[PDB]
Design a binder for these strands. Structure first.
Lengths: 97, 155, 236, 34, 125
RNA sequence: UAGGUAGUAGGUUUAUUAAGAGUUAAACCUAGCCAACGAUCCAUAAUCGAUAAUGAAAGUUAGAACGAUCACGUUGACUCUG
RNA sequence: AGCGUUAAUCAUAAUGGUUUAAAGGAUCCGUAGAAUGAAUUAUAUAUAAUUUAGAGUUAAUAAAAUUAAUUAAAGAAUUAUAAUAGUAAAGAUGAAAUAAUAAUAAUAAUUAUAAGACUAAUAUAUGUGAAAAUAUUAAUUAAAUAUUAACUGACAUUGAGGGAUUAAAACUAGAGUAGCGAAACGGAUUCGAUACCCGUGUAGUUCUAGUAGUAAACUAUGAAUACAAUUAUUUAUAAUAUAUAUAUAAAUAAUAAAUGAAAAUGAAAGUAUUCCACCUGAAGAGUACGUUAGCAAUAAUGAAACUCAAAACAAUAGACG
RNA sequence: AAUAUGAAUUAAUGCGAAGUUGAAAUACAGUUACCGUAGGGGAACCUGCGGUGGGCUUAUAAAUAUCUUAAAUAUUCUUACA
RNA sequence: AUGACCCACCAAU
């Protein structure tokens, strides 16, 4: 999770038929996603997300699909950094909204 | 230079990253060299060397008209926690549809705004921009205020 | 299968449970797999040189690195097809461990097939304590075999006591024969002498050669008792 | 679906029967000087 | 679809919602005269004697309609106001009529949904 | 609606015009010009905004209303006026 | 101080697809393409100038293949037809009927004439062709291979429209016509049998010149390029110190990954790039009508009204044969 | 010239809560089904030809097996040892 | 529950 509220970056994982396209949003933007993604997000912790499901909105598949997106296509900031051999930074706190 | 060649390079690197190959070769051209050099500087690659079709060169070999056909760029792929560091390499500008952005729109792309269906830059992604026959980072292009064709979105 | 994730990622997995509450007491092993992190890269790492024939894997003959018209009387200048057929898989491809000694091994065994018939101690004992001075075709521990002849020809081609491989091997080939010739006499001497010195023998090579054979005859004789006869009724 | 394709067959065959009846009307007073 | 192919025009199927009551030619309620009047059998799995009329309209387009409510004043040659709506069962009446205009009346004692079925607040003493 | 076009395509020289141009009128050359990236022909429609509506946005719709443009005042043509 | 409903508009998914659900063109050649496309350098993002990786061209060495068109041969049989001798059935079917079967002496046999179509094994359609297609033999002509070597110097990727070829049937001429077999007629079977079965057997199947331009023309899978993990067989082919074990390619068969609604695809149905064709619920409909083309049958082009909340595919149980 | 509306008669198709005849398809659906085409037939359909599998990968024995210290040695073995 | 109906069999590689 990013800042303990939303995903790290916009994603597009395709599970079976469901093509989820969730996008991280500014702190505040409430939970705006498919009913199922909402209850997963409600229990996961995500309280600021937004996205859409295209080909086949297979209710259950959306749910398997969503948690799969969170673990497959959501690399945390540390990983990106350690791996690339660099150090990425967070600028929103460097402003202290 | 040829984006078709760049498209083949980007697809090749993705395929090699999926099969977890440590070392792969790409065609020796100025475009592929500048592309691979930016990936190396940004830490997506472990190494960038000249070579032949057989392997990376051990010693310095001069590039002559006689040997140019055999010359390749050897690129070391990086892996961290059983995952490829170069997970995706996709063209933004296609051979049939080239996307030139002004510096202001490149700045909006870095600031989280979607432009001409190009999704905003995410943390740990790279967008390569072509300005004045050089390839550099999208942020680097904005820093030089060099408006030019966009290129690849590395993630 | 496909490079799995939930195999070398247990600590990451347990850690989460350990930080939340799904677990209360850490799995004892927790620390060990922390102290000794699991190799996670599963890269098909590349090869650069053949561990054996010393050949190189990774070079191209740039044309300039050449000037003598090939035997096919012809100065080649433009690179050739194979000379431009991206050979990257070759680097990953494991190279063949080619050994000229292996050819000599087969050559000797072909020239001396009875050596193959001779029992050999293929079972390798602590190969570590085996430094062997091979200027002589005999060593303590290692028995006599065509393999000794091979390891012998090496001195004659390394030290260069003789000349080419063919000549070298032969020099030791006659060296081997002698050891075998003397052994043959020694073998007979034991018996002859022991035979002429209070020695009784329950069974000899001729005895196994007859008993086992006569035993077999038991089966064949009974077998034809059915086959030949059964046909009489089968045809009468 | 082969059954669906077969129905075309029944339909083309039915239209062929109509064509045979229409063929009588064709090459007749209607298609000559009119 | 290669861009050149889209540039020519080969894109999303644009959903133009064809009218379902065209005969009301792009206009709300239109008035008309009840020609034929009959009762009809509804395509099953439903069965009940359906009450309807083959009204003609000002735009001079004949129409098959359906009379709602339990009680009607369908007198051949009445003038009514035709409305929109499918009769689901009657496989033909694609236009309904308004129980509350022209010569059509308002069901008696109609206690609820009176508007849709035509009726003025049954007042009391 | 697949071939269209003969002032048509262009050229030159006159008439008139505040004035360029087949714009008319005239005269005379040449052979063009347009077209399946849709010509010619037919049908429908006044056009538009810093206006109104809808959406996340691209857009999409409208054209009452605000305002901009056009066009007409029963039809047609012409004429003077200016 | 509105609520309904109706009538419109915007939104509500292409951040699609097309082996098997709509949905790849029969095939290829190739024009336009305001389609896309090598390298290097240097100019102000186009020129020039260089390059050889694409793509070509000509040798020379390998090694053989016949895929077209044409001409000339071969062969087992079949019918018929006499000759001959032989006798009473033959033949067909589930079983039987018939027909010009056979007392005119049949069938069977064995000779002998004639007429046609076809081409066993080999033979895997391996392959060869653009796709149609294509394995009896040869002759001529023509295309098609690999590897070097010389050259060319991006000359290309493939393509709207167009053109060319295009199975089986059909058609128009001319010859031919054994067998096969629509139609026809007869015999069966059957409740009925304008069927399956059986007997004659005509259009046709053959050739020759056409015409026409459609097939489940299907791998139901458009073409091109770059790339990605193994194995086993073909097999091409270099090499080795040929007969060996090696390096290459090529195909075929199992898969990894990946993709996928799944079935499964597997160097493509994967990762990518380019170009063309095509699809947008089901019925109505590839219909009507108009138009072009054809000797014609027809072929292409190709609507709408009316009516439904259906309609389709892969995987699963289960009942059924 | 074009469009539109009428026409005896006539064609196709759609819908309909329970008429008629046969049983073409799905199982080996009782003649394998479809594709192209031709002919025949009350009607589904039957028949000729080539094609396809969206039917036959639905693929599952020629039966025959060889010795060397059989051990007081192999077997026992827990830091080896030596 | 809607829910009055169902109709065909012929003989072998």
């Amino acid at each position: 999770r990013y800042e303990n509220r939303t995903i790290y970056g916009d994603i597009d994982f395709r599970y079976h038929g469901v093509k989820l396209h969730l996008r991280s949003a500014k702190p505040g933007f409430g939970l705006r996603v498919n009913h199922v993604i909402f209850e997963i997000c409600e229990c996961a912790g995500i309280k600021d997300l937004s996205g859409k499901v295209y080909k086949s909105r297979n209710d259950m598949n959306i749910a398997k699909g969503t948690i799969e997106a969170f673990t497959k296509a959501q690399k945390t900031l540390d990983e990106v950094a350690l791996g690339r051999g660099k150090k990425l930074v967070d600028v929103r706190k460097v402003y202290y909204s | 230079m040829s984006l078709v060649k760049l498209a083949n390079t980007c697809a090749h690197l993705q395929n090699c990253s999926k099969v977890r190959v440590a070392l792969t070769s790409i065609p020796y051209t100025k475009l592929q060299l500048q592309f691979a050099y930016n990936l190396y500087q940004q830490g997506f690659l472990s190494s960038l060397q000249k070579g032949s079709t057989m392997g990376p060169d051990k010693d310095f070999v001069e590039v002559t008209p006689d040997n140019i056909s055999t010359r390749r760029l050897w690129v070391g792929l990086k892996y961290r926690d059983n995952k490829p560091v170069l997970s995706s390499c996709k063209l933004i500008s296609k051979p049939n549809s080239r996307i030139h952005l002004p510096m202001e729109d490149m700045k909006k792309l870095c600031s989280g705004v979607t432009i001409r269906n190009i999704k905003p830059l995410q943390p740990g992604e790279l967008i390569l921009v072509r300005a004045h026959n050089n390839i550099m980072d999208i942020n680097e292009a904005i820093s030089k205020k060099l408006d030019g064709e966009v290129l690849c979105r590395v993630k | 299968m496909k490079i799995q994730t939930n195999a070398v990622n247990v600590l990451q997995r347990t850690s989460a449970y350990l930080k939340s509450g799904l677990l209360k007491e850490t799995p004892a092993w927790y620390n060990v797999v922390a102290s000794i992190p699991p190799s996670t890269k599963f890269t098909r790492e590349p090869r650069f040189k053949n561990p054996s024939n010393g050949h190189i894997i990774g070079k191209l003959v740039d044309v300039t690195e050449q000037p003598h018209a090939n035997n096919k009387g012809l100065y080649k200048t433009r690179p050739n097809s194979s000379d431009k057929r991206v050979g990257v898989k070759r680097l990953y491809r494991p190279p063949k461990l080619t050994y000229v000694e292996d050819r000599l091994r087969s050559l000797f065994y072909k020239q001396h097939p009875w050596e193959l018939s001779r029992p050999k101690i293929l079972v390798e004992n602590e190969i570590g304590d085996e430094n062997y001075d091979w200027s002589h075709m005999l060593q303590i521990g290692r028995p006599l075999d065509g393999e000794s002849v091979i390891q012998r020809t090496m001195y004659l081609i390394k030290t260069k006591q003789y000349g080419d491989m063919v000549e070298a091997y032969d020099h030791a080939r006659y060296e081997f024969y002698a050891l075998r010739m003397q052994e043959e006499t020694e073998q007979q001497v034991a018996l002859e002498e022991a035979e002429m010195f209070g020695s009784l023998f329950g069974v000899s090579a001729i005895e196994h050669g007859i008993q086992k054979e006569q035993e077999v005859l038991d089966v064949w004789e009974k077998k034809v008792v059915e086959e030949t006869e059964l046909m009489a009724a089968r045809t009468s | 679906d082969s059954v669906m394709r077969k129905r075309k067959k029944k339909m083309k065959k039915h239209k062929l029967r109509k064509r045979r009846k229409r063929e009588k009307a064709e090459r007749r007073k209607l298609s000559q000087g009119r | 679809a290669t861009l050149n192919q889209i540039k020519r025009g080969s894109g999303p199927p644009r959903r133009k919602k064809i009218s379902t009551a065209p005969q009301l030619d792009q206009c709300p309620q239109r008035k008309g005269v009840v020609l034929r009047v009959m009762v009809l059998k509804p395509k099953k799995p439903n069965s009940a004697q359906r009450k309807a009329c083959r009204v003609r309209l000002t735009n001079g387009n004949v129409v098959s309609a359906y009379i709602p409510g339990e009680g009607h004043d369908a007198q051949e040659h009445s003038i009514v106001y035709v409305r929109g709506g499918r009769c689901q069962d009657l496989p033909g009446v694609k236009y309904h009529v308004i129980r509350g205009a022209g010569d059509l009346s308002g069901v008696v004692n109609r206690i609820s949904s009176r508007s849709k079925y035509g009726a003025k607040k049954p007042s009391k003493s």
